[PDB]
Design a protein around this nucleic acid. Structure first.
Ligand SMILES: [Mg+2]
Ligand SMILES: [Mg+2]
Ligand SMILES: [Mg+2]
Ligand SMILES: [Mg+2]
Ligand SMILES: [Mg+2]
Ligand SMILES: [Mg+2]
Ligand SMILES: [Mg+2]
Ligand SMILES: [Mg+2]
Ligand SMILES: [Mg+2]
Ligand SMILES: [Mg+2]
Ligand SMILES: [Mg+2]
Ligand SMILES: [Mg+2]
Ligand SMILES: [Mg+2]
Ligand SMILES: [Mg+2]
Ligand SMILES: [Mg+2]
Ligand SMILES: [Mg+2]
Ligand SMILES: [Mg+2]
Ligand SMILES: [Mg+2]
Ligand SMILES: [Mg+2]
Ligand SMILES: [Mg+2]
Ligand SMILES: [Mg+2]
Ligand SMILES: [Mg+2]
Ligand SMILES: [Mg+2]
Ligand SMILES: [Mg+2]
Ligand SMILES: [Mg+2]
Ligand SMILES: [Mg+2]
Ligand SMILES: [Mg+2]
Ligand SMILES: [Mg+2]
Ligand SMILES: [Mg+2]
Lengths: 153, 394, 48, 63
RNA sequence: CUUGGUGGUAGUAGCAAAUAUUCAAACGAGAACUUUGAAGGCCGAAGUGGAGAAGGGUUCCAUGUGAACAGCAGUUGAACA
RNA sequence: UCCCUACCUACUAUCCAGCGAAACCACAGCCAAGGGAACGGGCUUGGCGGAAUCAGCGGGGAAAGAAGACCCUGUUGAGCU
RNA sequence: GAACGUGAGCUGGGUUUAGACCGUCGUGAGACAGGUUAGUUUUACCCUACUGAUGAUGUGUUGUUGCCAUGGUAAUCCUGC
């Protein structure tokens, strides 16, 4: 289907996407920036380090209230967190991403992740009860993911 | 409107950047202006704060009511083992300031001092001052050195010396040595230089530097106490019980139409770990440490002229949070800034101290060695053994 | 797997609280296939 | 420095510590610590208490 | 102003009433919360017990399910079939 | 209770994983005097000015709150005498 | 003196609601710069401000020991011989 950015050489690349994912939008954007240029083998390790609070993610745009941590200094920033949930999802997405490449006939250990992009999705809603008989909304913020691999040694 | 009942203000505005110091060791901000009358001598020294104890002495001050009486007086122990000279550095005087002209290190530098120039020692290869020490094993290197010294003969006015501590001997955990600059206040620059050139790479004890019944200025960092509210920091009045939203506060800050809040008003923050300067601390006694003679070592430091008993200043069960005091020390009157194991920078007085009190002569009668770890009731162990007797375990 | 039903019946048979019933943890799969009161009376006589 | 003795315990008091108590009748007493002080005010007879000297003295211990 | 939609404020305020959980094993893709056993605690017969009325109206029981709900999760449930 | 404050304990606040609001919002947000609807965040003239951010704090924003209930006007009313 | 400084800093005794007692006035409903007693004191997580805390540009990278242009500023008074 029509992706936003067309790859330069289809022979080299493979596509993959994922729709309507119950995750926080704001977490997934910044974690998605740090990985953007990296190697696939570095990242699948890297994300596992996040699960153990070993390597942080620097929070740049969506930075309101976020506490400081020491590991961010590698990136050149103070604020960082170890957002587990967002890691576990787009690790399923790489495996699904890699297998699909195998059908097209490529070497896995040359694949550089060239592009990634998040979009907001249709909000769900439940409610919470408050004082003096008032009922505010209590809304989810789910997100659309998509990504494009390119071979680069 | 006017305040009804006038009252003096809490605190001082002249200290009020109440902030955590970048530095941990106290900088000697300004040394004295040297004078030829005296021969050359060193202005400053580096000690460590061990603990506290009692003293007893007959005092002689005609005119006072306490004339011919045996008072007691509290004293600190500052362990000041000898420091090692490893360098000089010149300082030209300008209308802008006092620019550093040319530093000259020695050939051989110890590993305690080398430790300072690296963050991670285990990792590093320890390659410091290798290519430099070549200048001390060639004709050309010493030749440029001679040019350096001749320049410093001409143009440089002031000379400071780089003297590091011998931390290896101490019981502490850190092995990393403290370097430090020490200004020389003496005669002419040539003399001052040939003396330091003579003493380069040499030991320096304290008996050389300081003497007894001298007033000195103690510098050091305060014992930090963390976050404390404005009450404990600035010492305001507590509010009464009926308050809704708390009472350990200052209620009105400032007025309306000076629409800002002034800097003088007391707020909350960090207390302590402020750099500080106590003055007029009299040196009652420089006690000599442990040293071996005739096979056996002689360690009876606290034996005085009147008691003539063998005990040392080391109390029962060691000084708390320190170790065994083997090296030389000083016994200052009163408290001083800083906690245990804390470095304490001693300095000679800027002002010419000449009063009836400052010229007073000390004659100690007794040094208390009883335990600090609870209500001690025994000076020494043999006295204990006599009072108690033989135990079951023996 | 899921044995709250069997504990409940055991209590109704013995006419006591299920607080007192002791089951053998080892023969779990053997208990799970009970689903019936006479078959439990059989397990009682059996002694598990 | 008259190293005064403790009235209660029988220990030798050294100069800086301890706390003297001068009553209205006279009879200046010395005490090493509040432990002795509290027993003194509650009027417990020291000859019964083990750690004191008078106990081991009464029962002829040592020598 | 009317209806409908979307922002900053914010991934913040917050999920603090009445003492408490811990070890192993099983199914299962996955378990701080499921189940069993073991150990430690509480309600302490004016009860956090056993039975009824008015009132609710299939919520009772079993098997299976794991979309949505149970303000975290759940192999569970008064949810669904 | 006060001279006169100090120390200790539990629940929080704090940091983290998960989940996640609303009031409010013309633009925005460093000061002195000056004149001006006679007390300016913006104007004039002066003083100056350095990314992004954390925990606190209550001087200001004539802060939010509720088309002023006291007063007056109204050829607008009700309750009572 | 500074919005007769200072209430999202307190208190709420008095003024200044609703309940009630008295004297005088008014036939009465009611009145009194005439007395008396009981009577819900809201929100901060915004911007700035101050306080303290990470950090930022430039010298190719990195430590080291050091320099001071600027701000701040402190001591007081009394008794006896
Ligand atoms: Mg923001
Ligand atoms: Mg905050
Ligand atoms: Mg609620
Ligand atoms: Mg006055
Ligand atoms: Mg109150
Ligand atoms: Mg002590
Ligand atoms: Mg918070
Ligand atoms: Mg939080
Ligand atoms: Mg609650
Ligand atoms: Mg509780
Ligand atoms: Mg109870
Ligand atoms: Mg029942
Ligand atoms: Mg049922
Ligand atoms: Mg859960
Ligand atoms: Mg969390
Ligand atoms: Mg304005
Ligand atoms: Mg304000
Ligand atoms: Mg206001
Ligand atoms: Mg109105
Ligand atoms: Mg109106
Ligand atoms: Mg009208
Ligand atoms: Mg008219
Ligand atoms: Mg009418
Ligand atoms: Mg006013
Ligand atoms: Mg108020
Ligand atoms: Mg106010
Ligand atoms: Mg009144
Ligand atoms: Mg009448
Ligand atoms: Mg100045």
């Amino acid at each position: 289907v029509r992706y936003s950015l067309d790859p330069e050489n289809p022979t080299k690349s493979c596509k993959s996407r994922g729709s309507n994912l119950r995750v926080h939008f704001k977490n997934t954007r910044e974690t998605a920036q740090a990985i953007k240029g990296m190697h696939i083998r570095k990242a699948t390790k890297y994300l596992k380090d996040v699960t153990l609070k070993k390597q942080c993610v620097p929070f740049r745009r969506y930075n309101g209230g976020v506490g400081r941590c020491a590991q961010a200094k590698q990136w050149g920033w103070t604020q960082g967190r170890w957002p587990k949930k967002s890691a576990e999802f787009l690790l399923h997405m790489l495996k699904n991403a890699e297998s699909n490449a195998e059908l097209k006939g490529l070497d896995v250990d040359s694949l550089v992740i060239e592009h990634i992009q998040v979009n907001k999705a249709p909000k769900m809603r439940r409610r919470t009860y408050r004082a003096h008989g008032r009922i505010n909304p209590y809304m989810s913020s789910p997100c659309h993911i998509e990504m494009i691999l390119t071979e680069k040694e | 409107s006017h305040r009804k009942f006038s009252a003096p203000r809490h605190g001082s505005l002249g200290f009020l950047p109440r902030k955590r110091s970048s530095r941990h060791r106290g900088k000697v901000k300004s040394f004295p202006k040297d004078d030829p009358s005296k021969p050359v001598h060193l202005t400053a020294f580096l000690g460590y704060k061990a603990g506290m104890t009692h003293i007893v002495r007959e005092v002689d001050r005609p005119g006072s009511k306490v004339n011919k009486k045996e008072v007691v007086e509290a004293v600190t122990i500052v362990e000041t083992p000898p420091m090692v000279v490893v360098g000089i550095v010149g300082y030209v005087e300008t209308p802008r300031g006092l620019r550093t002209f040319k530093t000259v290190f020695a050939e051989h530098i110890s590993d305690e001092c080398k430790r300072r120039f690296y963050k991670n020692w285990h990792k590093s290869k320890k390659k410091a001052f290798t290519k430099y020490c070549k200048k001390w094993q060639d004709d050309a290197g010493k030749r440029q050195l001679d040019k350096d010294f001749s320049s410093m003969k001409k143009y440089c006015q002031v000379i400071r010396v780089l003297a590091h501590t011998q931390m290896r001997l101490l019981p502490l955990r850190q092995k990393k040595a403290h370097l430090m600059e020490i200004q020389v206040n003496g005669g002419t620059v040539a003399e001052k230089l040939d003396w330091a050139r003579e003493r380069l790479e040499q030991q320096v004890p304290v008996s050389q530097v300081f003497g007894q019944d001298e007033m000195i200025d103690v510098i050091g960092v305060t014992k930090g106490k963390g976050y404390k509210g404005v009450t404990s920091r600035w010492h305001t009045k507590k509010l009464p019980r009926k308050t809704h939203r708390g009472l350990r506060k200052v209620a009105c800050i400032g007025a309306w139409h000076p629409a800002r809040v002034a800097f003088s008003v007391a707020r909350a923050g960090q207390k302590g770990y402020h750099h500080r300067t106590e003055i007029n601390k009299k040196i009652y006694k420089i006690g000599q440490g442990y040293l071996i003679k005739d096979g056996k070592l002689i360690k009876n430091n606290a034996s005085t002229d009147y008691d003539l008993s063998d005990k040392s200043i080391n109390p029962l069960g060691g000084f708390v949070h320190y170790g065994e005091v083997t090296n030389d020390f000083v016994m200052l009157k009163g408290c001083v800034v800083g906690t245990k194991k804390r470095v304490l920078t001693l300095r000679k007085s800027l002002l010419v101290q000449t009063k009836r009190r400052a010229l007073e002569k000390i004659d100690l009668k007794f040094i208390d060695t009883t335990s600090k770890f609870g209500h001690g009731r025994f000076q020494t162990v043999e006295e204990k053994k006599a009072f108690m007797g033989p135990l079951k375990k023996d | 797997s899921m044995l709250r039903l069997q504990k409940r019946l055991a209590s109704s048979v013995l006419r006591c609280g299920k607080k007192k019933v002791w089951l053998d943890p080892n023969e779990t799969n053997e208990i799970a296939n009970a689903n019936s009161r006479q078959q439990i009376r059989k397990l009682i006589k059996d002694g598990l | 420095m008259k190293v005064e003795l403790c009235s209660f315990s029988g220990y030798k008091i050294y100069p800086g510590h301890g706390r003297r108590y001068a009553r209205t009748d006279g009879k200046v007493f010395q005490f090493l610590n509040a432990k002795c002080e509290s027993a003194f005010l509650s009027k417990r007879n020291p000859r019964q208490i083990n750690w004191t000297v008078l106990y081991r003295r009464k029962h002829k211990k040592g020598q």
